[PDB]
C-alpha cells in the first residue's frame, strides 16, 4: 500500500506540474518513481529472483485498483498507473523464467469471466504479452488450453473479444490452432444453445485470418510423427467442408444470421480459394425472400422473414 | 407436433424408468421448434409429480431452448425440494442452480442455496461427497461475483448462532481458490472471530 500510495502521489505531482508555467518555473524535475521502478525491473536482470513476486505482486495490485470502471482529472493518475502497470508486468515476462508460467495463469483467470466488467486493460497486456509466441510455448503451454476448454460457456461479447486478442500466438503455431480446432468443432455438436453462438464467432475469426489451417486419448496409445507433406486439395477440402458446417448453420437465431453476414465478407477477401462456393451461399439464400417475375410490385417478401411464436414477435 | 409431444409423454407416464430414459434423453432430436416451450412446462410438472426421474430432465432442460422467466419459475419449484434430493443428484443440481445465474440474480439464489443447503445425512457417501466439491471448485474456479455474494452471505447470517461445518468449510475452500479475495475473507474471519460467533 506504501508502495502504492507513492506511486500515485509522484503522478499526480507529473500531471500537476505539467499543467502550469510558473511551478514549472520555479522548480527543476526530479526522477519521478515511475522511472524508478520501470529502471529496477530492468536492473533485475541480474542474477537475482528474490524480487520478482514482490513485482508482478505490486503490478496486479496497482492494475486492479486504478482500472478504468466506466463500465475526469483524477482520471489522467488512474490511467497512467494503469499503463506503469502494464508495462512492468510485460517486462517481468521477458527478463525472468521461472515466474512467466504464473502471470499468464493470473492474467487468464482474470481475464475469462461471465462477470462483464471491463477488461480491456488485462486483454492488452494478454495481447501483449502473447506476441512473443514461442516463449509462451516453452513454459506454460497448458494455461492456454483449459482456457480453450471453458470457452464454450462464456457469451458473445466476451469470447469474440478473447480471440481477437490471443489470435497473434494462433498465427504461428500449429498445435494450438488444432486444439482449438477441436474445441469449436465439438462445441457445434453440442446441443446446447449459445454453444454455437460462440463456435461460429471462432470459426469465422479462425478462417478470414489464415489461408491455411489444421494438421498436416487412451493410455495405451502414443501419438507418432508421420513425414507426409501436407496436401493441398485436402487443406481445400478441409476449409470446403468447416465453410458448408457454416452454410447450414443459417437457420439459427438473429444474431449468428448478423455476425455470419458479417464476416463472410472478410472470409471472401482473405481467402481467394473459396469464393465460387460462399456465393452460392448467399445466392441460394437470398432467393427464399426475392420474388422473381414479371410484375409483382412488392418484389421483396415483407412477411418471410418475421416469426410469430408465443406472441413474442422477432426478426430472424 | 404438440398432440405428438403430449402422446408420447403420457405413454412414458408409466413406462419404465430404462427406456424412458432413453425417450427424454432423445428429446432434442424429437423436439418440435412450434410446441417447444409447451413441452417444457410438461417437464416441469412431471418433475413435480415424482421426481423419480429427477436427475436426467435437468441435464436435458438446458440443452432445450426455452423462456429464461419460465427457466426461473423452475428454479423457484426445484428450491422446494432441495432437502428430498439423494445424494448422487447433488452434484448435477448445484450444477444446474449455480450456472444459471445472471448478473443481478446473484446474491437472492447465492444465499437461498446456501442456507438450503446442509449435507448433514452424508460407501458412496465420501465419493459424493468428494464429486460436489469438485463441482463446486470448478464453478468457483472463474466467477468472483458468486464467491463475493457468498462472502456476503456468510457475513450477514442473521448474526445467529447457525453457522453450519459447510459455511466453514466453503469459507476455507474459497480462501484457498480465489486468491483476489484473501483480504475481505480474512477481515470476515476476524470480525466473526471477535464477534462470537464462532
Known amino acids: ?316 | 407436433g404438440k398432440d405428438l409431444t403430449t402422446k408420447i409423454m403420457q405413454l412414458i407416464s408409466i413406462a419404465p424408468e430404462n427406456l424412458q430414459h432413453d425417450i427424454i434423453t432423445s428429446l432434442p432430436e424429437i423436439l418440435g421448434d412450434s410446441q417447444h416451450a409447451d413441452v417444457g412446462k410438461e417437464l416441469s410438472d412431471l418433475l413435480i409429480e415424482n421426481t423419480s426421474l429427477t436427475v436426467p430432465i435437468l441435464d436435458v432442460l438446458s440443452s432445450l431452448r426455452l423462456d429464461p422467466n419460465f427457466l426461473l419459475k423452475v428454479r423457484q419449484l426445484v428450491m422446494d425440494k432441495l432437502s428430498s434430493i439423494r445424494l448422487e443428484d447433488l452434484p448435477v443440481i448445484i450444477k444446474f442452480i449455480l450456472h444459471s445465474v445472471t448478473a443481478m440474480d446473484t446474491l437472492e439464489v447465492i444465499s437461498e442455496l446456501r442456507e438450503k443447503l446442509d449435507l448433514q445425512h452424508c460407501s458412496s457417501g465420501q465419493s459424493c461427497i468428494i464429486l460436489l466439491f469438485d463441482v463446486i471448485k470448478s464453478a468457483i474456479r472463474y466467477e468472483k461475483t458468486i464467491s463475493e455474494a457468498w462472502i456476503k452471505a456468510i457475513e450477514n447470517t442473521a448474526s445467529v448462532s447457525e453457522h453450519k461445518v459447510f459455511d466453514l468449510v466453503m469459507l476455507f475452500i474459497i480462501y484457498s481458490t480465489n486468491t483476489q479475495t484473501k483480504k475481505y475473507i480474512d477481515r470476515v474471519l476476524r470480525n466473526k472471530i471477535r464477534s462470537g460467533c464462532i
Open chain 1, 1 to 316: 500500500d506504501l508502495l502504492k500510495t507513492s506511486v500515485v502521489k509522484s503522478f499526480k505531482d507529473l500531471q500537476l506540474l505539467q499543467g502550469s508555467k510558473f511551478l514549472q518555473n520555479l522548480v527543476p524535475h526530479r526522477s519521478y518513481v515511475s522511472t524508478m521502478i520501470l529502471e529496477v525491473v530492468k536492473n533485475s536482470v541480474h542474477s537475482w529472483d528474490h524480487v520478482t513476486q514482490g513485482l508482478v505482486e505490486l503490478g496486479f495490485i496497482l492494475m486492479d485498483s486504478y482500472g478504468p470502471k466506466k463500465v475526469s482529472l483524477s482520471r489522467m493518475p488512474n490511467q497512467h498507473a494503469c499503463k506503469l502497470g502494464a508495462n512492468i508486468l510485460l517486462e517481468t515476462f521477458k527478463i525472468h523464467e521461472m515466474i512467466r508460467q504464473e502471470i499468464l495463469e493470473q492474467v487468464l483467470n482474470r481475464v475469462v469471466t461471465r462477470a462483464s466488467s471491463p477488461i480491456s486493460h488485462f486483454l492488452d497486456l494478454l495481447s501483449n504479452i502473447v506476441m512473443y509466441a514461442p516463449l509462451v510455448l516453452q513454459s506454460c503451454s497448458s494455461k492456454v488450453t483449459e482456457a480453450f476448454d471453458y470457452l464454450s460457456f462464456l457469451p458473445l461479447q466476451t469470447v469474440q473479444r478473447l480471440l481477437k486478442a490471443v489470435q497473434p500466438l494462433l498465427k504461428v503455431s500449429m498445435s494450438m490452432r488444432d486444439c482449438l480446432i477441436l474445441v469449436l468443432r465439438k462445441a457445434m455438436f453440442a446441443n446446447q444453445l449459445d454453444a454455437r453462438k460462440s463456435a461460429v464467432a471462432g470459426f469465422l475469426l479462425l478462417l478470414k485470418n489464415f489461408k491455411v489451417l489444421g494438421s498436416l486419448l487412451s493410455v495405451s496409445q502414443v501419438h507418432v510423427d508421420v513425414h507426409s507433406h501436407y496436401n493441398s486439395v485436402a487443406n481445400e477440402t478441409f476449409c470446403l467442408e468447416i465453410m458448408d458446417s457454416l452454410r447450414r448453420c443459417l437457420s439459427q437465431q438473429a444474431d449468428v444470421r448478423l455476425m455470419l453476414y458479417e464476416g463472410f465478407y472478410d472470409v471472401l477477401r482473405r481467402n481467394s480459394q473459396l469464393a465460387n462456393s460462399v456465393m452460392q451461399t448467399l445466392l441460394s439464400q437470398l432467393k427464399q425472400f426475392y420474388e422473381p417475375k414479371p410484375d409483382l410490385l412488392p418484389p421483396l417478401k415483407l412477411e418471410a422473414c418475421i416469426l410469430t411464436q408465443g406472441d413474442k414477435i422477432s426478426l430472424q
